[PDB]
PDB file of C-alpha atoms in Angstrom:
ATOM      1  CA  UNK A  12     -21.822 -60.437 174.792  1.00 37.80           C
ATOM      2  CA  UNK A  13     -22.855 -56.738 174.905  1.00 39.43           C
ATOM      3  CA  UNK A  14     -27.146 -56.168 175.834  1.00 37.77           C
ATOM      4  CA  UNK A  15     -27.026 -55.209 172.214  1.00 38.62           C
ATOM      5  CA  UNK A  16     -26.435 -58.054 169.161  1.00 40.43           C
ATOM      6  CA  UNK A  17     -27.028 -56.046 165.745  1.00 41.49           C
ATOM      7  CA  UNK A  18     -31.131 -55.707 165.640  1.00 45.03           C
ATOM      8  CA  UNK A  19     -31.267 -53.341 169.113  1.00 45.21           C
ATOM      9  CA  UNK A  20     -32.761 -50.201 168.962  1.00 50.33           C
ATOM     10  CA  UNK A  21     -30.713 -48.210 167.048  1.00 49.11           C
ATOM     11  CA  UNK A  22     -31.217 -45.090 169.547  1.00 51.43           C
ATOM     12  CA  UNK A  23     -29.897 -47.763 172.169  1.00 51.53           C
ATOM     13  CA  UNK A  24     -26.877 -48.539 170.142  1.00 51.48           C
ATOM     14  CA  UNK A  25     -25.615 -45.176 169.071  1.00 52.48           C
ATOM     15  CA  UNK A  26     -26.812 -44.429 172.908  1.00 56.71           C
ATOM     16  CA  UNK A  27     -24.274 -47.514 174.731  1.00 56.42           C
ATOM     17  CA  UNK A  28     -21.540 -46.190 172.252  1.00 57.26           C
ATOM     18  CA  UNK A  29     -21.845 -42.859 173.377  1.00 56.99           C
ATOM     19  CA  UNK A  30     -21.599 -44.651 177.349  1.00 54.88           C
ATOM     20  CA  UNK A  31     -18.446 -43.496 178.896  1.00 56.05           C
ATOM     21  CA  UNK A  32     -18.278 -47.307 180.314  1.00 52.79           C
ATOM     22  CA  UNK A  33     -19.448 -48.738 176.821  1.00 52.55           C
ATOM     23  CA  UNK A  34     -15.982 -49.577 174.893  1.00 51.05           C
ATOM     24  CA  UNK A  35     -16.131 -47.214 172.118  1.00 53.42           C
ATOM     25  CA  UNK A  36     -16.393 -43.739 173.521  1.00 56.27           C
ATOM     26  CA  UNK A  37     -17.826 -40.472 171.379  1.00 54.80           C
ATOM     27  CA  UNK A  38     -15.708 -37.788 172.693  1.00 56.57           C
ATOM     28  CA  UNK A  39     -11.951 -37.597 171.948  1.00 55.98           C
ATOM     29  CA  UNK A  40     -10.308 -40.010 169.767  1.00 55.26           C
ATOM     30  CA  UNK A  41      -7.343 -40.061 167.459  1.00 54.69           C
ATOM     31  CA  UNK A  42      -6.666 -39.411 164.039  1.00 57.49           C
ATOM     32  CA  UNK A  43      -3.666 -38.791 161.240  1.00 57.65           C
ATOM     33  CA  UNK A  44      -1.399 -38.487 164.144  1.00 56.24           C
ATOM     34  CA  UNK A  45      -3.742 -35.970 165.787  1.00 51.36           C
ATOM     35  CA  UNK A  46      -6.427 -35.663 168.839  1.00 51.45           C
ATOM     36  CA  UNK A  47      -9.400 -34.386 168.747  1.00 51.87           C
ATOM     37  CA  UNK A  48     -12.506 -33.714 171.355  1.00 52.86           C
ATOM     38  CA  UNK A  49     -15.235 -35.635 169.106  1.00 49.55           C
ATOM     39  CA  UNK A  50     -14.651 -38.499 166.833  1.00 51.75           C
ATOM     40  CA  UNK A  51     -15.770 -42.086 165.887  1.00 56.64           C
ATOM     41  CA  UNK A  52     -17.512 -42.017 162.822  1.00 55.00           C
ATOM     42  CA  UNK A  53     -19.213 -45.681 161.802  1.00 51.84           C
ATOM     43  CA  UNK A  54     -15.493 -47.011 161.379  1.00 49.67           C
ATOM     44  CA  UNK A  55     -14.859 -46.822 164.583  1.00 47.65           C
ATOM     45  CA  UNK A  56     -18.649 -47.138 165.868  1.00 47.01           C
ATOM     46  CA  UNK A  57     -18.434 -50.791 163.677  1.00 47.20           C
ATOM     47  CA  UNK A  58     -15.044 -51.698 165.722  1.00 42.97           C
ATOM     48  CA  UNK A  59     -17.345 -51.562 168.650  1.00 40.92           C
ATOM     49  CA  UNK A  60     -20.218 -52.905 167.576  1.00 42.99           C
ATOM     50  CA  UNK A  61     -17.908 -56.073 166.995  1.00 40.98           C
ATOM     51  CA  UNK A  62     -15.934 -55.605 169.949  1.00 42.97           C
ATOM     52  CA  UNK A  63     -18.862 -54.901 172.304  1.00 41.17           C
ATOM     53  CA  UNK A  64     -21.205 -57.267 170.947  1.00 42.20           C
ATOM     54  CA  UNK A  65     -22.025 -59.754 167.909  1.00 40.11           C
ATOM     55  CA  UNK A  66     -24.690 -60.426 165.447  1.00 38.56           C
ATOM     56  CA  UNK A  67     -23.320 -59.493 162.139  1.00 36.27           C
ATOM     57  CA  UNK A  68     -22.534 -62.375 159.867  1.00 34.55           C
ATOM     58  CA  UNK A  69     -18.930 -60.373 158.256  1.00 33.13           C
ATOM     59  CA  UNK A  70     -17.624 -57.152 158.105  1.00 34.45           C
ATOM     60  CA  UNK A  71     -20.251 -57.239 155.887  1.00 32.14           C
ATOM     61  CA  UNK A  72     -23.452 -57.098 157.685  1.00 33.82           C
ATOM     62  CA  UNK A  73     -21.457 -55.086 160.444  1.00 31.44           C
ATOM     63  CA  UNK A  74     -21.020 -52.717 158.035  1.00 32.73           C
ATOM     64  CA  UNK A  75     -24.953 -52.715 157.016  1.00 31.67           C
ATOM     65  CA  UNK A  76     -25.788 -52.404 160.558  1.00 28.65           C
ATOM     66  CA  UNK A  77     -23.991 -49.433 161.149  1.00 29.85           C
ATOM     67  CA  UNK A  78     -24.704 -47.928 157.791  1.00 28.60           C
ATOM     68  CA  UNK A  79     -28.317 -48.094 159.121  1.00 28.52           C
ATOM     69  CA  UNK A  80     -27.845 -46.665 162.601  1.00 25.87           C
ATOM     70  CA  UNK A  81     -26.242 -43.514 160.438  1.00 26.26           C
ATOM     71  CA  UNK A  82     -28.814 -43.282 158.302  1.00 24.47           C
ATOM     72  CA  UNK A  83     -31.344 -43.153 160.909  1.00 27.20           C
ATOM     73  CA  UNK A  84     -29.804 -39.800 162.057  1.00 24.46           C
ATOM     74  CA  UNK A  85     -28.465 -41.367 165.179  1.00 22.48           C
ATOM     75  CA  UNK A  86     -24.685 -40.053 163.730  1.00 18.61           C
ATOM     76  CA  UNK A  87     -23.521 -36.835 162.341  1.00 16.66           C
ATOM     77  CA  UNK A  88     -21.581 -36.386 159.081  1.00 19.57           C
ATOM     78  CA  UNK A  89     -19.629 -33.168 157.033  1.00 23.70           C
ATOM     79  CA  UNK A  90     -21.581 -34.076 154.194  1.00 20.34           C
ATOM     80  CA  UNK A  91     -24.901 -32.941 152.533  1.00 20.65           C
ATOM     81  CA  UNK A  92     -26.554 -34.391 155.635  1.00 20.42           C
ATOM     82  CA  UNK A  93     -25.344 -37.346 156.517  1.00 21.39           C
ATOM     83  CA  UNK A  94     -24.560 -40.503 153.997  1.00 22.45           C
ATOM     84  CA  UNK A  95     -22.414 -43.141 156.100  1.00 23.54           C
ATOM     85  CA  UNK A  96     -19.250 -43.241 154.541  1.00 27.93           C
ATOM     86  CA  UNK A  97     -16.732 -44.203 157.650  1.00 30.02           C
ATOM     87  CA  UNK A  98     -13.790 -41.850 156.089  1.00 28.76           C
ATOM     88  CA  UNK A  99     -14.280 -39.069 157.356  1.00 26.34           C
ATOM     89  CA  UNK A 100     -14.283 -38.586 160.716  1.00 25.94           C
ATOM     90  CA  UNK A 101     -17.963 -37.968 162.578  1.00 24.73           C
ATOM     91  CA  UNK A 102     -19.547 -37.136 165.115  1.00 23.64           C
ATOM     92  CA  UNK A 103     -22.985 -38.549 166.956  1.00 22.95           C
ATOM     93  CA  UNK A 104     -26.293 -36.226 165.762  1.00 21.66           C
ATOM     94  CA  UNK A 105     -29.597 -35.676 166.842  1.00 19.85           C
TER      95      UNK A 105
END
């Protein structure tokens, strides 16, 4: 499993995601039949978290964790300021 399991630093987690050797990758990704140079958002940061590693009891908790790691400003939203929401594509903040 991943160095990370669901209660690892938050920084650390948004930081391994951002890894170009971590799984997940913020930097081009795909979306409505389209590329782009910057996009993950928690959907895809939750895939990860999964895939990478394991803690979260469902899609549930998964969810919660990654809902957190937003809300700690370790992610970047289009919204008011940031508000997890894994629909609309996002990109890593600081």
């Amino acid at each position: 499993e991943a160095p990370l399991t669901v209660k690892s630093d938050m920084s650390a987690i948004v930081r391994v995601m951002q890894l170009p050797d971590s799984g997940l990758e913020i930097r081009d990704r795909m979306w409505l039949k389209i590329t782009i140079a910057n996009a993950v958002i928690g959907a895809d940061v939750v895939d990860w978290l999964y895939t990478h590693v394991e803690g979260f009891k469902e899609r549930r908790e998964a969810r919660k964790y990654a809902s957190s790691m937003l809300k700690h400003g370790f992610l970047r939203h289009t919204v008011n300021k940031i508000t997890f929401s894994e629909q609309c594509y996002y990109v890593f903040g600081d």
